[PDB]
């Protein structure tokens, strides 16, 4: 079968698990105070920062190549306006990569160094998530921490050079589907992104705390 379908399959559990945790609750119910969300931005930004790098670093690998979108996709700058918005210019010297977070930074680079036919696993959890679920969030956010309309602190939840979310994810998945892939590798990949979900549950449970 189809790359794309055994991950909708194959994750939908793990998925459900992060899906369900009471930090994301008390996010779409709008009980997240500025500090925790701001603790939770700070972690968006280290993971993909990480993440954006390892794409960068196999922007030319056949295993990748195909999916590498720095201008369709790519988060850390617009997670840098978010930073600056809610922490000052100095942000970078006030904040520090939350543990759990740490642990998917380190997997993400290992994955992006010596496994990057895996790389797929994790922009999949990670983009196609935000392209269909992006406006939702964003409103909440704004709605709960008074955020300015103008879309300060909100710019990560926006692709504004994304003009049909889900025709890219279209685009993106028909891309993935074509990789050059045997059985072996596409469940490798399947479990991989398991392993992904499984990590941003970690991360949702030491916000929680």
């Known amino acids: 079968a189809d790359l794309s379908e055994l991950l909708k399959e194959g994750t939908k559990e793990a ?4 899906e369900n945790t009471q930090f ?6 709008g009980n997240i105070k500025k500090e925790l969300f701001k603790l939770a931005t700070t972690a968006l930004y280290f993971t993909y920062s990480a993440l954006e790098e390892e794409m960068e670093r196999n922007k ?11 201008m369709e996709l790519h988060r850390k700058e617009a997670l840098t306006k978010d930073m600056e918005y809610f922490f000052g210019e100095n942000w970078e ?10 642990k998917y930074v380190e997997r993400i680079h290992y994955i992006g160094q010596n496994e990057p036919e895996l790389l797929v696993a994790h922009a999949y959890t990670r983009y196609m998530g935000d392209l269909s679920g992006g406006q939702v969030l964003k409103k909440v956010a704004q ?11 909100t710019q990560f939840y926006l ?14 998945r028909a891309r993935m589907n074509a990789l050059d892939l045997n059985m072996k590798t596409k469940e490798r990949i399947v479990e991989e992104a398991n392993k992904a979900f499984e990590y941003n549950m970690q ?5 929680d705390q």
């Open 60 to 70: 030319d690998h056949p295993a990748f190549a195909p999916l590498y979108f720095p």
């Open 159 to 172: 692709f504004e050079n994304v003009d049909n979310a889900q025709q890219f994810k279209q685009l993106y």
């Open 143 to 153: 709605r709960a921490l008074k955020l300015p309309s103008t879309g300060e602190g």
């Open 203 to 207: 991360i949702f449970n030491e916000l």
């Open 93 to 102: 010297e006030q904040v520090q990569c939350p543990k759990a977070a740490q």
């Open 24 to 29: 994301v609750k008390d996010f779409l119910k």
């Open 15 to 18: 998925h459900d698990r992060a």
